């Protein structure tokens, strides 16, 4: 059967929103469009500028808070050694482009990068990791178990990892999943970080879903 | 009868107010049916 994105299930209980703004119903469509444009930009830039310098760049999430004056972007990021160490620091170099995109009329932009302490207590980062290893034609067993290890030494109470597609390039697709510790998906009180990710292989697409249970 | 566009009912169902089902008291309805003279 189908479950609900455990993100969406708890909204306004144990999980905040990402875009924190408000708009009158007409402007709502426009504003949403703007958020999409800058999320697009900021993902593209970081992808191209970090994967040229050969590193694993966690982009954990993008929080956007619109105020009448200044629109502020907070990047939750796992390893900003790639973004900070380059000479044109990501702050300014992105500030210029992201402010090219939305508008500068009545709105100026502020970029603030946040270091998420434990990178492997976040699903999104971890799934980018497995995506890297499976893009390397490492067997999925090894990748799964490495992820499990890194994470359970990274302080996690429970985790469930699913990988679906043509596995090892074999002709008939399948679904392989591992549950570890304790992961209630039905308990609304439980803090649950979910993430979905997609990979492009020689053999076509591969999906990864990850559940992380941080406690109540 | 609800399928009658000549009746208040049928207008009200068809969502067209018209000669039969008037907007206000000042819009002329169809020619009056008022007179009858029973006595006794």
């Amino acid at each position: 059967g189908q479950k609900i994105n455990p993100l969406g299930f708890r909204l306004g209980t144990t999980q905040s929103h990402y875009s924190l703004w408000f708009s009158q119903p007409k402007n709502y469509a426009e504003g949403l469009q703007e958020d999409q444009k800058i999320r697009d930009c900021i993902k593209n830039y970081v992808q191209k500028n970090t994967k040229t310098s050969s590193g694993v760049e966690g982009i954990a999430r993008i929080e956007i808070q619109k105020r009448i004056d200044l629109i502020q972007v907070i990047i939750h990021m796992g390893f900003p050694k790639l973004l900070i160490e380059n000479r044109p620091q990501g702050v300014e170099d992105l500030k210029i482009n992201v402010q090219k995109e939305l508008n500068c009329v009545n709105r100026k932009l502020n970029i603030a990068i946040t270091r998420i302490a434990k990178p492997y207590g976040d699903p999104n980062i971890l799934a980018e990791f497995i995506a890297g290893q499976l893009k390397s034609r490492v067997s999925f067993r090894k990748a799964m178990k490495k992820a499990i290890e890194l994470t359970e030494q990274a302080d996690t109470k429970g985790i469930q990892i699913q990988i679906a597609g043509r596995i090892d390039g074999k002709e008939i697709a399948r679904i392989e999943w591992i549950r570890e510790g304790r992961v209630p998906l039905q308990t609304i009180r439980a803090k649950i970080d979910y993430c979905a990710y997609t990979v492009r292989t020689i053999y076509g697409v591969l999906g990864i879903k990850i559940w992380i249970f941080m406690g109540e | 009868g609800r399928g009658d566009r000549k009746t208040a009912k049928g207008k009200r169902f068809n969502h067209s107010f018209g000669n039969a089902r008037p907007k206000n008291k000042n819009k002329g309805r169809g020619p009056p049916k008022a007179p009858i003279f029973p006595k006794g």
């Binding site: 609900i4 990402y18 875009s19 408000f22 469509a29 949403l32 469009q33 | -």
Partner: protein
């Protein structure tokens, strides 16, 4: 869908921007001004601008995908993308609602 449909739409928008106030003007002109044989020529003016200049010719498509059907206006988005994005919490104020 096809890129070319989104392009058709863009070009319609642009043309409607060009001829917008001309349309309002010839419209209030044929509305307010009598003399039927005069309205022949002002409706000869109406029929000159490109058929892609009419506001009834514009068509709203979802701005992420471009899906021509199923567009709930407030979000300028098609139902599916709208839904996934309700689950990744990109929509401010959006909550699964049980009344």
């Amino acid at each position: 869908a096809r890129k070319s449909l989104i392009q058709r739409e863009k070009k319609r928008r642009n043309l409607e921007q060009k001829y917008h106030l001309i349309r309002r003007s010839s419209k209030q002109e044929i509305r307010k001004v009598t003399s039927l044989s005069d309205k022949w020529e002002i409706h000869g003016k109406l029929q000159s601008p490109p058929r892609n200049s009419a506001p009834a010719r514009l068509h709203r498509r979802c701005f992420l995908t471009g899906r021509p059907r199923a567009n709930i206006r407030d979000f300028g988005l098609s139902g599916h993308i709208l839904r996934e994005m309700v689950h990744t919490c990109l929509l401010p104020g959006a909550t699964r609602s049980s009344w």
